[PDB]
Structure formats: C-alpha cells, structure tokens
Amino acid sequence: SMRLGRIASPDGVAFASIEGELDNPGAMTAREIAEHPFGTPNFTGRSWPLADVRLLAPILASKVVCVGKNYTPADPVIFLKPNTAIVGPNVPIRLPANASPVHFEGELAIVIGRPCKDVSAAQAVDNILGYTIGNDVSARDQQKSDGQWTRAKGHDTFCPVGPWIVTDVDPADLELRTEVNGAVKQHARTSLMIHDVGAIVEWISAVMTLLPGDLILTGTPAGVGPIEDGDTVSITIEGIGTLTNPVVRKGK
Ligand SMILES: [Zn+2]
Ligand SMILES: [Zn+2]
C-alpha cells in the first residue's frame, strides 16, 4: 500500500516510499528503500522531507509499450517508445526545432512488477507493481509523414513519467485531467477505456515478455493538443497525483 518513487538525496540515488497527504507534496517524507522495490521492500532507516531531495522518474524501464486509440471493438494497436525518451517530473520536454505540431497525451501508466509472458487479463493484477502517469509526447507531422509512429513518439524527453507509482490503486474508474498553462485540455475517466488494464496486459504479454519496471502507456482521452516553448503541461490522475513538465523548443 505505497507510493514508490526514485530520489536523488545526499546519500545518492535510491528507491523510496513517498509518504504523506497528496495535497502537501512539500511536507511528504521520502523513506529510503534498501532492497526489493518490486517485492516486499525493506528500508535503510534514512528518510528526508521530499522538498529536500530531487524526485526522479519512478522507474528505469527496459521498454515502454504503448496503446493507440483506447478511449470511447477493434484489437489493441501497440507500439514502442525507447527508454531514452523517459524523463521524470519537472524535467523539460525538448521539442525538435523542426517538429510541429507536437502534442501532449496524458495517460494512465502500468508498471510491471515481475517477469511475465502469456498472462490472462484476470491474472494481470498479480503482475502489476502499480500505476503512474505518462505523457505520450507525439510529433504529429512525423506520424503522418512516416506512417509508423516510432519516430514521432521516440524523441528524447517524449516520455515524461511520474510522479511515483501507486501500488494499491484500482485503475478501473479514475479521473484523468490534463492542463497546459492551467487550462484544462483533457478531462475524462479511465472507465472510458476501450481495452481495460487486464486486456492490455493480456494482449501485450501474448506478444512479448514483460520485465519488472516495464512501462505500459494505456492510451489518451479526447482533447490532445499542441505544446510550445514556454508551456507547462500537468497531467493529474485521481488516486495517483500530478505529473508536471515544462516545455522548451530547441534552437530558441
Ligand atoms: Zn474533474
Ligand atoms: Zn498515446
């Protein structure tokens, strides 16, 4: 029953249990994890107020598997983002000088907690560490131009993830809200997903082995739109928190 994150503290880089009321992130306690972040974590004894440490991307994923069109049936359409696209909370998304329009896409993210393959939808729960937030950043011109979505979605910084992974949250009916400079762009519930978390894990794990720490982005609701130099994009998911990233365009 925890928020699993990663931190850069005085004593270095570590997993941590991030404790406290969600509406006061400053006064939250980062309780340093020693071993077994995907099993039963044990703790070093050290902790810091969260304000005192750098909050990082909550996982080092070997791959990011993603779902296309998934909000209100056709089979899931999946694609990959390279783990070099991942950044954590508050790290800038850097737009290539030549790419326009570049879109945000707020998404519920699944974090896989153990090696698995050929998992049934009903068994997905036993293989899921928990849930976090992803921003499936996408160069739309490049999507249309390539047909394949890989390049459009694969630029460095195009996979913000965080702020942390919640292990006990039920993904079936959670609100997701995306803001760009405080203006609401996406506003929907995960209960509108065409393929639910179990169906997504069943589908993907029938294709490829999923490893502890692997991320799955489960698709974005209506209201996708452009981001530009100077913008800030915040995605909030109920029961999880808020993933926020500034935006800069290269060459400015
Ligand atoms: Zn709302
Ligand atoms: Zn997406």
CATH at 30: 2.30.30.370
Q: At which of 58, 74, 94 does a domain end?
A: 58
Question: β-pairing, 241-249 with 215-217?
Answer: unpaired
Helices (H), the chain: 140-146, 150-153, 197-207
Radius of gyration of the chain (CA): 17
User: Å resolution of this model?
Assistant: 2.0
Q: Examine residue 171 and say whether the peptide bond preceding it is cis (omega within 30 degrees of 0).
A: no
Does 124 share its domain with 50?
A: no
Has 35 been labeled as part of a binding site? no
Taking the C-alpha atoms of residue 118 and residue 112, their distance in angstroms, rounded to an integer, is: 14
Tell me the technique behind this structure. X-ray
Residue bearing tokens 């406290």: 20
Does 33 share its domain with 66?
A: no
Nearest ligand to the C-alpha of residue 135? 2
Has 21 been labeled as part of a binding site? no
* Domain extent at residue 9: 1-58
CA–CA distances in Å: residue 238 to residues 97, 101, 104, 172, 221: 34, 28, 19, 11, 15
Q: How far away, in angstroms, is 102 Cα from ligand 2 center?
A: 13
What lies within 8 Å, CB to CB, of 188 at 6+ separation is 71, 175, 176, 221, 222, 223
How is residue 48 written in tokens?
Answer: 């810091």
